[PDB]
Amino acid sequence: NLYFQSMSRVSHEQFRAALQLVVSPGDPREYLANFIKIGEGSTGIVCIATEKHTGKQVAVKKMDLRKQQRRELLFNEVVIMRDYHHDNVVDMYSSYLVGDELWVVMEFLEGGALTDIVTHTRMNEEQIATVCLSVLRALSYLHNQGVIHRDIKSDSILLTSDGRIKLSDFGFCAQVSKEVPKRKSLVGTPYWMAPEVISRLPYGTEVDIWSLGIMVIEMIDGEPPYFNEPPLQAMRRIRDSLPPRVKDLHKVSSVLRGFLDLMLVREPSQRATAQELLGHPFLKLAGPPSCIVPLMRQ
């Protein structure tokens, strides 16, 4: 009968101590040099540095711990990035505390986000299949470890300079287990959220498959369904309406329509799993990284 207070209530020093148990010890400025800022706000800053031992370029996200309003999501995120690694997930090399800052040392990807592509170009089905295959491989791995991303959208998909596709931004992720197999939290970016999450029903890894389907509609039509409406209004339609369809059915192949139909299924138990989707004929259309390069802004 001792009450331990929630992470939002503890001292800044004990928030930091919590993080100290899960980050790498020491000071990364020992092995990193030549920091150049490339992004900012609102919690911190992003820099490119050069590893002194190797000359390798890395990205370092520096976040002010006193500005973190979602302390527990950050804590949970740091553990996931530490423990899970996959070629289609932006890799965290190591994390550290420097004063009141969390330094996250990440792989440096120079190809921008998928959002820039879907808002300015028209992807072909080969290119769509390539993105889907990459994301589904990441999800295959993550879902098998009980990790739910919860925030799949074009904005969170980053590209290497040579056209490889990587899932990023695990700020909203969750980990389920045999003991706690489902989550209940209302988390995500409105237009991409699964109906069961919006209904506040217990949910698992299946929510990422719905969100993926919405991203496929982004890649087809340029925006997710109901993007012209206010987010809370869009959420009501997701929760209560039949699954969204593409604008022009006749301009999407039978195989891609079938793939989409397996993902945008309201009942989670009837929705395809990442494992099942990897065997879908649509993904036999996937190409090499070179097929993505012509889409990129440069």
Author numbering: -6 to 0, 425 to 715
Quote the passages of the study that discuss this structure, keeping the authors' original sentences.
PAKs are serine/threonine protein kinases that are regulated by Rho GTPases of the Cdc42 and Rac families (Knaus et al., 1995; Manser et al., 1994; Martin et al., 1995). In humans, the PAK family comprises six members, which are classified into groups I (PAK1, -2, and -3) and II (PAK4, -5, and -6) based on their domain architecture and regulatory properties (Bokoch, 2003; Jaffer and Chernoff, 2002; Kumar et al., 2006; Zhao and Manser, 2005). Group II PAKs (PAK4–6) regulate a wide variety of cellular functions, and PAK deregulation has been linked to tumor development. Comparison of five high-resolution crystal structures comprising the kinase domains of all three monophosphorylated, enzymatically active group II PAK family members revealed a number of catalytically productive and nonproductive conformers presumably representing snapshots of catalytic domain movements during catalysis.
In order to elucidate the molecular mechanisms of inhibition, we determined the structures of a 2, 6, 9-trisubstituted purine inhibitor (N-(cis-2-Aminocyclohexyl)-N-(3-chlorophenyl)-9-ethyl-9H-purine-2, 6-diamine) with PAK4 and PAK5. Interestingly, PAK5 crystallized with two molecules in the asymmetric unit; one molecule was found in a noncatalytically productive conformation with an unoccupied active site (apo-PAK5), and the other bound the purine inhibitor and was in a closed, catalytically productive conformation. The detailed mechanism for the group II PAKs was best highlighted by the structure of PAK5 complexed with the purine inhibitor. In this crystal, the asymmetric unit accommodated two molecules, only one of which had the purine bound, allowing the comparison of a catalytically productive, inhibitor-bound conformation with an open, catalytically nonproductive apo structure under identical crystallization conditions. In PAK5, the phosphorylated Ser602 forms a hydrogen bond network with Arg600, Arg567, Tyr620, and Phe589. This hydrogen bond network links both ends of the activation segment via the catalytic loop residue Arg567. In the PAK5 inhibitor complex, the last turn of the αC helix is distorted and becomes a loop region, thus adding length to the αC–β4 loop. In contrast, the N terminus of αC gains an additional turn with the rearrangement of the βC–αC loop. In the PAK5 purine complex, the αC N-terminal extension leads to the formation of two hydrogen bonds, between the conserved αC Arg487 and main chain residues of the glycine-rich loop residues Ser459 and Gly458, respectively, as well as the formation of a salt bridge by the carboxyl group of Glu457. In the catalytically nonproductive PAK5 apo structure, Arg487 is disordered after the γ carbon.
